[PDB]
Amino acid sequence: AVDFINYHASDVLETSGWKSMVVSHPHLVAEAYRSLASAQCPFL
Amino acid sequence: GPVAESWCYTQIKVVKFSYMWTINNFSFCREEMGEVIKSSTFSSGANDKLKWCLRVNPKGLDEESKDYLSLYLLLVSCPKSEVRAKFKFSILNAKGEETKAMESQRAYRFVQGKDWGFKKFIRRDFLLDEANGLLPDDKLTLFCEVSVVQDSVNISGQNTMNMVKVPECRLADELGGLWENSRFTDCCLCVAGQEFQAHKAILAARSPVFSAMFEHEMEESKKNRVEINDVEPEVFKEMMCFIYTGKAPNLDKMADDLLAAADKYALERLKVMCEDALCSNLSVENAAEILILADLHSADQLKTQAVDFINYHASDVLETSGWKSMVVSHPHLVAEAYRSLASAQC
Amino acid sequence: VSVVQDSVNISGQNTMNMVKVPECRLADELGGLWENSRFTDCCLCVAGQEFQAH
Amino acid sequence: VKFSYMWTINNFSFCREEMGEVIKSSTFSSGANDKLKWCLRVNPKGLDEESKDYLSLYLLLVSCPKSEVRAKFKFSILNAKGEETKAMESQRAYRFVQGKDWGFKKFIRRDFLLDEANGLLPDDKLTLFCEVSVV
Amino acid sequence: NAKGEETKAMESQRAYRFVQGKDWGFKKFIRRDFLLDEANGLLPDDKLTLFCE
């Protein structure tokens, strides 16, 4: 699911469920950022 | 070289653009001759209304070139009529030095939609050879330098020249030298138990937040004593010096609390100069508290620059206990960091 | 099988225009306060017309 | 009645224009007498194709009260050290009118100027020293 | 001329590029004898009246 969110975040941040996750579950967004950090985006 | 009774100094202004342009996986040019790879538009700080772009044809533009790499420079937007310039291209090799450098000796004129360059720039076999290393890891790196000429101007240094010395406008130094004298101060002003004898007239003149606070039901009774506790005297005297003299020379040593006070007082110039001070001090260990102060003080540009710092140093900034504390205390900052590092970058 | 796609330009600009600072306050604020005409410390009547200053 | 004038052009290798163009300087005089205004019109290319490859330099009188002015001018170029070099002097007291120029068309070869070993173009800057005698 | 009508009018076809102190003209504008002949009427009252566009 973390991989899927990293893949399809272009709509997930628009959907309201991600906002609920941001509000209530800070650690989930932190762990998704940690996976997104050292993977699938380090070229720039 | 004797002394001249009159001299003149003719100054043709020149500005320099410097540009890098890297194509990944170049062997997948993916098409035949005539095709073009435009670059993103680029400029410098001044005037920033002239926008240039690169056109590179991987195959031959013409039937005479064919097995040739061709590049051109194209000017897309000109607020003036015409701009004269010289360009110089060079392919960076595997190590990074400039090779195959070709330039136009002529200061070509430029209009919107007009493009100039080298069709016969570098041989295709010479590029595609691996021994010269002109294509390291199928990455093509192009460095262009653009030199734009402007109008000449003469300062006319002929002598006798109104030979009295003209001082500049003296609003700043005259107001600055009155603080140590402490004259014309109608009221008192104490911060954190320390007295700083200043008056409300020039403060009301030079800070609209404070003046709007002054006219509303405080000057009738508590004009003489005003309660300020948000800053220490070392920040308050620096802000008072900035108000009177117009500058804050003691910036680097206390840039952070000066920025906090400036965010409190909506002093945009003080905020941006403290942000300029702190941008060069971006570091792995301090990035988390830098982000926290930027978010609290709504410095969007500093937030973006720190986001870029975290993007460039994501290998080590995350495991810092400061960033862990920022995670545990500020979910929104981590959410925005994820949004920027995901949507914009990839 | 390798499918190629339309390329995209990242469009970086190091140091760009920095923060694009607003107008100065060295002597503008004098003029802004005079336009707002507040803190009327005195009323000097000279040749009939009235002028205010500090 | 000796005027002296040290005129400096920077980034001259960006002469910025083609054959037969002009670059005017500032109008100058001395504190005495001060109503005879002069300006150097230099041409980075040749003025004419008959004598191409030349830095044709002229002296042009813009403001004059009288009908004519008799003057002798001497042009010179300072090198990297700063001494007077290529001192070309007009032997005659040439007559000047409002809107009239005199000078040396075959003043100096451009190829002779462009040698970096000669030191006649230091830091892409050229300094012209002109001495004018009005009789 | 004496009647004031245009005579010996000519123009350069190109749009010339002028700079600070650059001159462009016709060196061979008119025959001096054609000007000086009184019968042509081009020098009325010893007055040369010129027009420029």
Q: Any residues with CB less than 8 A from the CB of B165 and at least 6 apart, and which?
A: none
CATH number for B262: 3.30.710.10
Q: Which amino acid is at D131?
A: E
- The reply to whether B128 and B174 lie within a common domain is no
Please tell me the distance from the alpha carbon of residue E6 to that of residue E10, in angstroms, as a whole number: 10
Task: Compute, in degrees rounded to 10, the torsion defined by CA atoms E28, E33, E35, E36.
Answer: 150
Q: Are residues B24 and B135 in the same domain?
A: yes
User: D16 is written with which tokens?
Assistant: 């910025």
Alpha-carbon distance of E23 to C24, in angstroms, equals 45
Dihedral of CA E26/E30/E36/E40: which sign?
negative
Residue type, C26: L
- The two three-digit tokens of residue B269, written as one number: 């110039």
What's CA B46's distance to the chain center, in Å? 11
Residues D3/B4, Cβ–Cβ less than 8 Å: no
Which chain D residue shows the shortest CA-CA distance from E17?
Answer: D21
Query: What percent helix, strand, coil does chain B show, rounded to 5?
Result: 35, 25, 40
Decide if E20 and D17 are in contact by the 8 Å CB cutoff.
no
Question: What is the enclosing helix (H) or strand (E) of C51?
Answer: strand C50-51
What's the CA gap between B139 and E48, in Å, rounded?
73
Instruction: Give me the residues paired with residue D102 across strands.
Output: D59
Q: How far is CA B62 from CA B34, B70, B119, D8, in A?
A: 7, 10, 8, 45
Range of the domain at D35: 3-134
B54 part of contact set with chain C, CB < 8 Å: no
Experimental method: cryo-EM
Burial of B75 (C-beta count, 10 Å sphere; 0-12/13-18/19+) = buried
Size of interface B-D (CB pairs under 8 A): 66
Cα separation, D78 vs D56, in Å, equals 16
> What is the arrangement of strands in the sheet containing D23-24, beginning at the earlier edge strand?
D23-24, D37-42, D57-63, D100-104
Residues of chain B contacting C30 with CB distance shorter than 8 Å: 171, 205-206
D16 touches chain E (CB under 8 A): no
Looking at residue B213, its amino acid is M
**What is the DSSP secondary-structure string of D35-83?**
--EEEEEE-SS-SSSTT-S---EEEEEEE-SSS-EEEEEEEEEE-SS--
Rounded to whole angstroms, the Cα distance separating E14 from D133 reads 41
Q: Indicate the SS3 state at residue E19.
A: coil
At D101, list the tokens: 């120029």
Q: How far apart, in whole angstroms, are the C-alpha atoms of residue B137 and residue D37?
A: 66
Residue D69 φ/ψ, nearest 5 degrees: -130, 130
CATH number at residue D41: 2.60.210.10
| Strands B6-23 vs D2-9: parallel, antiparallel or unpaired | parallel
| Tally of CB atoms within 10 A around D42 | 22
Chain D and chain E touch, per 3+ beta carbon pairs within 8 A: yes
- D53 within 8 A of D46, measured Cβ to Cβ: yes
* B26 and B144 housed in the same domain: yes
Angle between helices B255-265 and B268-279 (to 10 degrees): 150
Chain D residues in contact with E20 by the CB 8 A cut-off are 22-24
Q: Are residues B132 and B211 in the same domain?
A: no
Here the tokens at position B309 are: 């710092």
For chain D, the chains sharing at least 3 beta-carbon pairs closer than 8 angstroms are B, E
- The distance of D86 to chain E (nearest Cα, Å) reads 26
Q: Give how far A40 is from chain B: nearest CA, Å.
A: 8
Give the separation between CA D32 and CA D14, rounded to whole angstroms: 36
Tokens 């040698």 -> residue: D115
3-state percent helix, strand, coil for chain D, nearest multiple of 5: 5, 40, 55
Residues in chain A: 44
Q: What is the DSSP string of B7-39?
A: EEEEEEEEEEEEEEEEESSTT---S-TT--EEP
Q: Do D7 and B8 touch (CB under 8 A)?
A: yes
Judge: C26–B205 Cβ closer than 8 Å, yes or no: no
Count: domains in chain D: 1
Measured between CA atoms, the residue of chain D closest to residue B156 is D26
Residue pairs between chains B and C whose CB atoms are closer than 8 Å: 54
The contacts of residue B79 (CB under 8 Å, 6+ apart) are: B47, B49, B50
- CB–CB contact A33 B334 (8 Å): yes
Residue D123 is encoded by which pair of tokens? 């830091």
Place of tokens 């975290």: B310
CA-wise closest residue to B315 among B343, B294, B287, B295: B287
Long-range own/partner contacts, residues B332-337 (CB < 8 A, 24 or more apart): B332/A22, B332/B295, B333/B291, B333/B292, B333/B295, B334/A26, B334/A29, B334/A30, B334/A33, B335/A22, B335/A29, B336/B303, B336/B307, B337/A33, B337/B291, B337/B307, B337/B310
C3-8 long-range contacts, CB within 8 A, separation 24+: C4/B28, C4/B30, C7/B37
Q: Do chains C and B touch (3 or more CB pairs under 8 A)?
A: yes
| Angle (CA) B135 B136 B138, round 5° | 65
Q: How far is CA A12 from CA A20, B224, B319, D24, E30, in A?
A: 11, 57, 26, 66, 84
- The 3-state DSSP class for residue D9 equals strand
CA distance B62 to chain A (A): 35
Nearest CA in chain E to D20: E22
Query: What six digits make up the tokens of E10?
Result: 């000519």
Q: Under a CB-based contact definition with an 8 Å cutoff, are residues D36 and D29 in contact?
A: yes
Report, in this order, helix, strand and coil percent for chain E, each rounded to 5: 20, 0, 80
Give the span between the Cα atoms of B346 and C32, in whole angstroms: 47
HSE-CB at B139 with a 13 A cutoff on CA atoms is 11
Determine phi and psi for B201, rounding to 5 degrees.
-65, -55
Pairing of strands B6-23, B140-154: antiparallel
Contacts of D26 in chain E (CB under 8 A): none
Residue B185 CA to residue D8 CA, distance in Å, equals 54
- The structure was resolved to a resolution in Å of 4.3
Return the closest-CA partner of residue D42 out of D133, D115, D129, D124. Answer: D129
Residues B205, C39: C-beta atoms closer than 8 Å: yes
Identity of the residue numbered D53: D
Q: Which amino acid is at B156?
A: S
Instruction: For residue C19, give the nearest of B205, B208, B275 by CB distance.
Output: B275
Cβ pair A23:B331 closer than 8 A: yes
Determine whether D37 is exposed, middle or buried from the number of CB atoms within 10 Å of its CB (0-12, 13-18, 19+): middle
**What is the C-alpha R_g of chain B?**
29
Q: In the numeric block, which tokens belong to residue B332?
A: 């929104």
